[PDB]
């Protein structure tokens, strides 16, 4: 009975179309029309870490807004310091290829992983004085894409075998798998509440992933090529996309539907990273060419520029704080521009 | 800052020993292999990775074989690699269409706009002892004949040539059609017996660094 | 982890002998070294310090181009080479390991030490009282004065507290006068207002009884304090 099925997805996807269109009462576009504007906000590159060698592909921001850990293909992870611009920690990789990396949120521990399909778990606070790799979580048949601690025991991991799954790195196994997409997923970002993590993929879609209960939630298809980066709203209810159709989209989970479209027609490029200013105000985004915007979240129009790589932004994250921004591109330089 | 400036020396240290590191891996030239299953694909050299030494460069390969398909995102990783190794089975005639499709996608990805691409068309002996028994060709094949100039193996019969030079040219054709002079393909024939590989792949990197260079300095 | 000094036994004044510590257990090559003296029924004195890369030594005002230290990395092996020795020198020389990076634990692990007999504008800290008898299960606050203030520029108060157990070696207890070091009970906690600290404790127990020591490593010179006798 296939035909019966496909009748039957056809209707369910018809359903939610018109539930998405009916609860559209107004574009948030609207909404913003009445609301001051931010200006050209001029940033400057305070420091420039100059440590790396070849390109890199992830870094991630400390608990105290202070200790930054970036991944290049050097295979070498290091652990700075925004402040000081001295470095603390050069983990070695045993796989050269990285395309993730995690900070734990007691600074305790730091996530790898790559093309070598594990996800490797290091040690900080050892009695020993040199980091060690506590654990491999070895169960994905895939290439990693992005890790992200929940604790001091979970790591979720997005794999382009097209699954995501939640792990426990006492037992090194995979405690829950999510087997929903249809391709490679390339990001992931966790929610303030921790119980709720989403996930893009390059099937030009979004999930948001129940990390307890194992299944998705909502399913977003606004976008008309990849999603190579996705970042989570700090209010726990938006999160905005960085996809290679030089698109950067927001979507709040309440409502389940599209609400902006960050674009230009001078773009033309893709999107490496996204992230969200403290108060929500500032979506910055990586681009491909060159250089690193900083769009307005509300009236999505640009409100600033950061000229300052001459090669792919690659990673972007801002502050626990707000305090600073930093960004690495194939340069092999990140800089932190207050 | 009593404490700070052993930080510093940290900092110091660590960038000396990246430093360190760094130096040792500029002077090796990176190679991606990619090709069908059904093809040679680790017998060609004679995640997964390989290193072989020629005329004192030092050469590092590289083989993903841990996805199945749909390459569009890890290829991008390797944007900086001297060549591209692309292994082909000419004897599975029934196998050529999909390797030829997965040429075309190899040659007009965007991220390798710049990437040459070297091209072996394993298992020529068995192509040999396959023209014969039961090989009508799918494609059009009366139509080509044998380039006049041709140089052709000693003893090597007509059909055998004509057959070889055609999958030749179906190749390189698809490598001409849009490639704009920044990257060329480099076509080899290669049975499993053959040791001399090595050197091709040696002699292809050498030329790929030469136009680079040409086109680097203008000249 | 594990540290282990080698040394001990008599030397005739004007003579001259070197200790050498031994380390097992840990990345000897990452952390810094350093040396603390102390005299036969009295309190400590910073000796010398030798950091990683052998790149910043330090001597204190009274061993300075007698005493010399050096660090063998390859061997994991430490020397303090030691040439003018007088009575002021009887004193068992200890070792303690220090890693300085942001979060870091300086002065976390202290060896034995060898007990060696023989036959102004530092940062002088001074503490309150020689002794206090306290009954278990009191909270007893110490008192320490800081001639200069320790809150350098970078916000940081740089104030070390410890505990000599009964014939023991010092375990860090306090490392920058607020923060609470590894595998040290949750009762004992800082409190400092910017130039006299206090330490303090929950409730005293058994392993509680000793002589507690203060540190200032806001400059090269590391003042210690007369230590406090608690008993009960």
């Known amino acids: 009975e296939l035909d019966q099925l496909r009748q039957e997805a056809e209707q369910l996807k018809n359903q939610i179309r018109d539930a998405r269109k009916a609860c559209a009462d107004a574009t948030l576009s609207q909404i913003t029309n009445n609301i001051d504007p931010v200006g050209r906000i001029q940033m400057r590159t305070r420091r420039t870490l100059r440590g790396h060698l070849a390109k890199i592909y992830a870094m991630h921001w400390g608990t105290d807004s202070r200790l930054l850990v970036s991944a290049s293909q050097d295979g070498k992870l290091i652990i700075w310091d925004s402040y000081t611009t001295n470095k603390v920690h050069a983990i070695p990789l045993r796989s050269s290829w990285v395309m993730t990396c995690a900070y734990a949120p007691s600074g305790n521990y730091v996530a790898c992983g790559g093309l070598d399909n594990i996800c490797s778990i290091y040690n900080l606070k050892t009695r020993e004085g040199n980091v060690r790799v506590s654990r491999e979580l070895a169960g994905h048949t895939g290439y990693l894409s992005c890790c992200r601690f929940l604790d001091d025991n979970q790591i979720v991991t997005s794999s382009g075998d097209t699954t995501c799954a939640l792990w426990d790195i006492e037992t090194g196994q995979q405690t829950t798998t999510f087997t929903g997409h249809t391709g490679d997923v390339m990001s992931l970002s966790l929610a303030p509440d921790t119980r709720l993590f989403v996930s893009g993929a390059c099937d030009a879609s979004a999930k948001l992933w129940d990390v307890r209960e194992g299944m998705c939630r909502q399913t977003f298809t606004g976008h008309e090529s990849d999603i190579n980066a996705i970042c989570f709203f700090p209010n726990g209810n938006a999160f905005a996309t960085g996809s290679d159709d030089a698109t950067c989209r927001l979507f709040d989970l309440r409502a389940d539907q599209e609400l902006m479209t960050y674009s230009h027609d001078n773009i033309i490029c893709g999107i490496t990273s996204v992230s969200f200013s403290k108060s929500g105000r500032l979506l910055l985004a990586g681009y491909d060419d060159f250089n690193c915007n900083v769009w307005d979240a509300l009236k999505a129009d640009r409100a600033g520029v950061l000229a300052g790589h001459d090669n792919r932004v690659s990673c972007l994250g801002v502050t626990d704080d707000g305090m600073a921004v930093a960004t690495g591109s194939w340069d092999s330089f990140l800089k932190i521009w207050n | 800052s009593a404490e700070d400036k052993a930080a510093a020396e940290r900092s110091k240290m660590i960038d000396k020993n990246l430093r360190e590191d760094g130096e040792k891996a500029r002077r090796t030239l990176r190679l991606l292999l990619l090709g069908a299953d059904n093809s040679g694909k680790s017998t060609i050299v004679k995640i997964f990775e390989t290193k072989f030494q020629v005329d004192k460069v030092n050469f590092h390969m590289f083989d993903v074989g841990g996805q199945r398909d749909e390459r569009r995102k890890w290829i991008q990783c390797f944007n900086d690699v001297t060549a591209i190794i692309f292994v082909v089975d000419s004897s599975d005639y029934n196998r050529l269409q999909e390797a030829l499709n997965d040429f075309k996608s190899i040659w007009n990805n965007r991220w390798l706009r710049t990437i040459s691409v070297i091209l072996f068309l394993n298992k020529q002996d068995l192509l040999a002892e396959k023209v014969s028994k039961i090989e009508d060709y799918f494609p059009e094949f009366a139509r080509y004949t044998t380039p006049e100039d041709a140089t052709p193996e000693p003893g090597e019969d007509p059909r055998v040539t004509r057959a070889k030079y055609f999958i030749r040219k179906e190749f390189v054709d698809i490598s001409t059609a849009s490639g704009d002079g920044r990257h060329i393909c480099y076509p080899h024939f290669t049975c499993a017996v053959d040791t001399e590989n090595a050197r091709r792949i040696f002699n292809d990197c050498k030329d790929i660094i030469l136009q680079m260079n040409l086109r680097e300095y203008n000249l | 982890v594990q540290l282990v000094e080698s040394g001990g036994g008599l030397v005739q004044p004007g003579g001259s002998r070197k200790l050498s510590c031994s380390a097992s257990?840990?990345?000897?090559?990452?952390?810094?070294m350093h040396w603390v003296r102390q005299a036969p029924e009295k309190g400590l004195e910073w000796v010398a310090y030798?950091?990683?890369?052998?790149?910043?030594?330090y001597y204190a005002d009274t061993v300075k181009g007698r005493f010399t230290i050096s660090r063998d990395d390859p061997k994991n092996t430490l020397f303090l080479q030691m040439t003018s020795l007088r009575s002021e020198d009887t004193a068992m020389y200890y070792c303690?390991?220090?890693?300085?990076?942001?979060?870091?634990?300086?002065?976390?692990?202290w060896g034995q030490g060898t007990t060696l007999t023989v036959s102004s504008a530092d940062i002088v800290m001074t503490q309150a009282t020689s002794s206090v008898p306290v009954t278990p299960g009191e909270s007893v606050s110490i008192s320490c004065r800081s001639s200069?203030?320790?809150?350098?520029?970078?916000?940081?108060?740089?104030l070390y507290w410890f505990l000599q157990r009964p014939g023991q070696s010092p375990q860090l207890l306090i490392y920058?006068?607020?923060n609470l070091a590894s595998g040290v009970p949750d009762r004992f906690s800082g409190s400092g207002s910017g130039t006299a600290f206090t330490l303090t404790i929950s409730r005293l127990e058994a392993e509680d009884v000793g002589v507690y020591y203060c540190?200032?490593?806001?400059?090269?010179?590391?003042?210690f304090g007369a230590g406090t006798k608690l008993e009960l």
């Open positions: 257990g840990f990345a000897f090559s990452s952390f810094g």
């Open positions: 200069k203030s320790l809150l350098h520029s970078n916000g940081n108060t740089y």
């Open positions: 030798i950091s990683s890369g052998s790149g910043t030594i």
């Open positions: 540190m200032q490593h806001l400059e090269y010179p590391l003042t």
């Open positions: 920058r006068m607020s």
């Open positions: 303690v390991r220090s890693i300085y990076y942001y979060g870091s634990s300086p002065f976390d692990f």
